[PDB]
């Protein structure tokens with residue numbers, strides 16, 4: 160229907176993207192070119208109208224250009240109203256707030272996506288700081304997303320510098336609710352929200368007329384606690400200086416991210432960081448690369464963040480911080496071959512590793528098997544009330560839980576398939592140690608046997624030495640005999656290394672789950688059915704009221720969403736989880752049987768080397784006879 164216009168651009172007010180206090184932005188096009196731009200039509204601008212200062216202000220912001228900041232192309236005045244309109248580049252993909260509405264990120268964004276936002280936000284925020292311009296109000300609803308040429312998102316800043324001539328309540332700083340840290344506060348709240356999927360400080364009901372408690376939480380924040388939430392009405396505050404279990408981030412990343420947030424989330428400027436320390440420590444985190452490590456004994460995958468110029472000694476040490484294995488017993492395997500790392504080798508030249516093909520870590524010393532430990536979350540109660548707004552929030556919650564369950568279920572299958580290979584490779588590598596012990600033993604055996612005969616023949620070729628010649632002769636059979644006693648014990652190990660030898664991995668090819676089971680794809684089918692219903696309830700919430708037929712289909716759909724969820728989690732716990740714990744139970748035992756075999760065969764190999772010294776002495780010594 161009706162739609163406003165300008166000299167160069169036009170748009171209909173139906174296509175609405177954002178409703179701000181001073182303005183409204185809609186989806187618009189250029190009057191020749193037809194390209195999309197965001198139209199900021201200023202509403203109620205007369206008592207201001209500083210065509211004096213804002214002219215110069217917006218002209219300055221126009222040429223201000225960077226890849227991580229929304230570009231202001233032009234400022235025009237409307238035809239029908241003489242209103243001033245900023246025309247900016249259109250971000251097709253929404254804001255960070257829109258992505259956090261997605262249930263897949265209800266418990267936090269993917270680790271990779273978190274690094275993109277973090278990198279872009281700081282760089283954009285840093286570009287305005289070099290110009291002195293500073294924001295304070297940075298919020299996911301104010302951080303837009305577009306898709307870059309490489310396909311991965313690029314985040315930009317967009318509605319800053321609007322606080323001089325005339326913070327989100329949840330992202331406000333304690334003293335400003337009623338410098339250096341006051342900047343950094345809303346960003347840390349943003350970063351906690353992108354990693355966890357929820358806000359740091361939460362009263363029980365929430366941000367309403369009982370919001371005085373919230374302010375006490377912020378003002379009562381002890382130490383380097385990054386979060387504080389009361390789980391009951393008017394109850395105590397559960398404080399924590401670490402991140403939750405539902406966090407999709409790797410544990411190695413949390414160790415570096417935690418100090419940043421603890422130091423950038425505190426009201427006192429005495430003990431809190433500046434933009435320089437902040438830019439330094441996070442930029443420190445982004446330049447490090449990731450090397451994927453799977454501890455095969457304990458079944459835990461790891462992401463070690465290292466600078467490319469760091470050595471392999473701190474690498475073993477940092478690995479000790481996550482697997483707690485001392486560097487000298489840590490043994491690496493890669494692409495099924497053992498891997499030798501010099502203590503001073505740089506990380507740039509490490510082999511290329513992924514989570515589906517990492518560097519395995521094995522230890523001779525026993526280690527407990529932990530597995531993936533994630534937080535068990537059940538479904539919430541579905542009320543029969545028709546509150547569409549309530550039905551929408553409940554849809555995001557219940558669908559996000561199954562998203563979490565489906566990611567873990569996808570992680571558990573990865574762990575098993577990874578366990579299965581690392582086990583199959585390990586035995587062929589330890590048998591190579593077995594291929595090598597008889598190996599090196601054959602050098603001793605024929606030299607020894609013939610050596611005894613030369614001494615056993617010289618008695619025929621030719622009282623004093625004859626009595627001991629026999630005695631050395633007894634000892635040479637004492638050792639040829641012991642060469643004979645261990646020889647029997649190594650073929651016994653060979654019977655177990657053989658298929659069906661009580662060490663085979665056939666158990667691993669049976670108990671757990673496989674991609675052939677297709678258990679993860681099955682849950683995404685039901686989970687997709689649920690999200691469209693979710694995005695539909697938002698669409699019904701936007702109407703505020705629905706016609707009759709649609710309200711009853713909405714009541715039909717809201718009930719199938721519960722039935723879908725129960726169907727998936729039941730398939731999750733009764734098939735995927737249980738068959739995983741059974742694969743984990745038989746996993747600790749087989750390593751015990753493998754590490755036991757590795758220590759005995761170990762000894763037999765040194766006993767064979769133990770013996771080599773004895774035949775190296777009799778090799779010479781007695782043939783070492785001196786004579787004119």
Ligand SMILES: CC(C)Oc1cncnc1-c1ccc2c(c1)N[C@@H](Nc1cc([C@@H](C)N3CCN(C(=O)CC(F)(F)F)CC3)ccn1)N2
Nearest residue numbers: 173174175176177184186197247249250251252253317318
């Ligand atoms: C909101 C306030 C902070 O906004 C500003 C304030 N100050 C300065 N700049 C901005 C500013 C600048 C650039 C842009 C935005 C805001 N919003 C942004 N794009 C968009 C895209 C979207 C995404 C979900 N899709 C929605 C469907 N869809 C439409 O077209 C529907 C239609 F057809 F009905 F329109 C295509 C777009 C959402 C929100 N913003 N792009």
